[PDB]
Structure formats: C-alpha cells, structure tokens
Design a protein around this ligand. Structure first.
Ligand code: J3V
Ligand code: J3V
Ligand code: ZN
Length: 257
C-alpha cells in the first residue's frame, strides 16, 4: 500500500485515491502577502483542561496519541468554526533534516516538523460520519522549529522507544496537550483535506502563526522511529510529509494583521 517512498509516495496516491487531484487538497503554501485579513473571524476557543489521553501508537506512517472522544472533554470552538469539535488524536510529520518536515509552508519556508491536532464535528455523531461532510473535521496545525527544548513534549519523546515499529502501542494516560501550544493563537484558515489517504475533502484547517521550539535532541528521537514492523529490515520513519498542493479557487484568511 501507500507510503512515502519512491514507489508508493504522494506522487502515486492518485491511482488509488483519485481525489488526490481534487479541488480542495492539503497542504498548501501560505502566501502571507495574499492572505486576507478577515475581521469577522473570532478568536479560537481551545478547552483542553479535561482531556483524557488513552494510547500512543505507531501506525506505520506516523505516531499518534489518542483521546477519549465519547464526551465533550477536550473541544475546539470559535475561530472559523460553527459548533463544537472534539479532540480525537494528535500526530506529527517531520523530516530527515531540520530544513524540511512540515506539510504547510509559509512563503515557501519549510519547518522541521508539523503537529496536527485532529477534531471532529459532534453534530455528525461519530468521526466516520464526519469525514463524509465538508465541515466534518477541524485540524489545528502547529509548526515546530529547532531551538530550545519544549518541556511539554518530553514525555512523548521518552516513550517513543516503546513504539519503535509499526503496530506497537502503549498506554499513554494523563498527558496534557496544552503543553504543546504556542503563546499566541493567531491563525490562518482555509478549507482543505486530510493529507494522508483517503485524502477526504472534509477539513477546516486552522494553522497557527507562531511556531513552537523543540530541541535538536527531541526531534532526533522522532527520526529513530521505524516505518517497518518488528523483525523486518530497519527503515527509518522520516520525511512523512505531503508536498504542497495547488490552491485552486480558495482564499486563505488570516485572523490577524
Ligand atoms: N482521525 S481522522 O483523520 O479524522 C479519520 C477518520 C476516518 N474515518 C472513516 O470513517 N472511514 C475510512 C476512510 C478511508 C478508509 C481507507 F480507504 F483509507 F481504507 C477507511 C475508512 C478515517 O478513515 C481516517 N483515515 O485515515 O482513513 C481518518
Ligand atoms: N495529516 S492528517 O490528514 O490529519 C492524518 C490522518 C490520519 N488518519 C487517521 O487518523 N485515521 C483514523 C483515526 C481514527 C479512526 C477511528 F478510531 F475512528 F476508527 C479511524 C481512522 C493519520 O493516520 C495521519 N498520520 O499521519 O498518522 C495523519
Ligand atoms: Zn497530519
């Protein structure tokens, strides 16, 4: 199946997932001079104090931390969104070198990694229904640059040895995702898609302007994960990012001047 290699990477995905060539695909390059300030946008409302993390897992293309989404415990509201969206999981995309790894770019600048917090619209009842709707998901995207360490990330870093290969999972309770947020919640937003198969065009993207800083030692440990399963030849999990897609007839809106 699909992946990020020469023979099964993003340039191949359209053969199995023809929506890869669709009209609202992600990621995109954010041109800061053509983004449109929109004064009708509201501040984001991030309510994560009651979040219940469950598991951390290596799914063969990234690693994810999952949350209990059976109640309104960790929700995203406001911004460009109508309604309440529940946090389901977060995961990262990263590079083999510090100058690549993010999926979105800003004036063509690539960051070392990108954090995606995936939320789904509770009006649709479960996440499987939400992925079939044009407003079903909201993904909060946060850029990572290399610099000072991020203390709130260290406990994710320290458990990655236990999920090195695809299919491994571990208990990962009492993790507070508020420690992954930058100080400012100013954002760009646009209508887009999942950046992995099935590439469904169901996502309101909210990309934060302010990156978080992580240390070289922290991102190094991402690069030690494996795409392969246990007992298979080692293949390092790096460069699990999709390149920017055509913007087509979309406008990126900014919440700030
Ligand atoms: N956590 S999420 O981003 O919001 C998210 C939600 C769903 N929900 C589905 O109901 N169905 C589905 C879609 C495609 C496949 C297929 F065809 F890929 F196998 C299989 C099943 C999902 O599939 C994925 N996903 O990644 O597939 C991600
Ligand atoms: N970049 S992205 O478009 O946001 C993105 C989406 C997915 N897919 C899912 O999360 N699938 C999924 C999650 C839960 C269910 C459940 F539990 F509902 F069945 C069903 C399906 C993903 O694995 C990654 N990734 O890199 O790991 C990135
Ligand atoms: Zn992602």
């Amino acid at each position: 199946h699909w992946g990020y290699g020469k023979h099964n990477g993003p340039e191949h995905w359209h053969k199995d997932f023809p929506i890869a060539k669709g009209e609202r695909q992600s990621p995109v390059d954010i041109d800061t001079h053509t983004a449109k300030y929109d004064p009708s946008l509201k501040p984001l409302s991030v309510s994560y104090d009651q979040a219940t993390s469950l598991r951390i897992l290596n799914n063969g293309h990234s690693f994810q931390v999952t949350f209990d989404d059976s109640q309104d415990k960790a929700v995203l509201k406001g911004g460009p969104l109508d309604g309440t969206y529940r946090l389901l999981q977060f995961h990262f995309h990263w590079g083999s070198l510090d100058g690549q790894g993010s999926e979105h770019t800003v004036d063509k600048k690539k960051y070392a990694a990108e954090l995606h917090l995936v939320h789904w619209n509770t009006k649709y009842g479960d996440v499987g229904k939400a992925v079939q709707q044009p407003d079903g998901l909201a993904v909060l995207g946060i850029f990572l640059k290399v610099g000072s360490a991020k203390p709130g990330l260290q406990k994710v870093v320290d458990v990655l040895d236990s999920i090195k290969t695809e299919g491994k999972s571990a208990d990962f309770t009492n993790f507070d995702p508020r420690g992954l947020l930058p100080e400012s919640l100013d954002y760009w937003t646009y209508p887009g898609s999942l950046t992995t198969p099935p590439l469904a065009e169901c996502v309101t993207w909210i990309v934060l302007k302010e990156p978080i800083s992580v240390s070289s030692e922290q991102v190094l440990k991402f690069r030690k994960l494996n795409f392969n399963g246990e007992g298979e030849p080692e293949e390092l999990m790096v460069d699990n990012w999709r390149p920017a897609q055509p913007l087509k007839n979309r406008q990126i809106k900014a919440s700030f001047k």
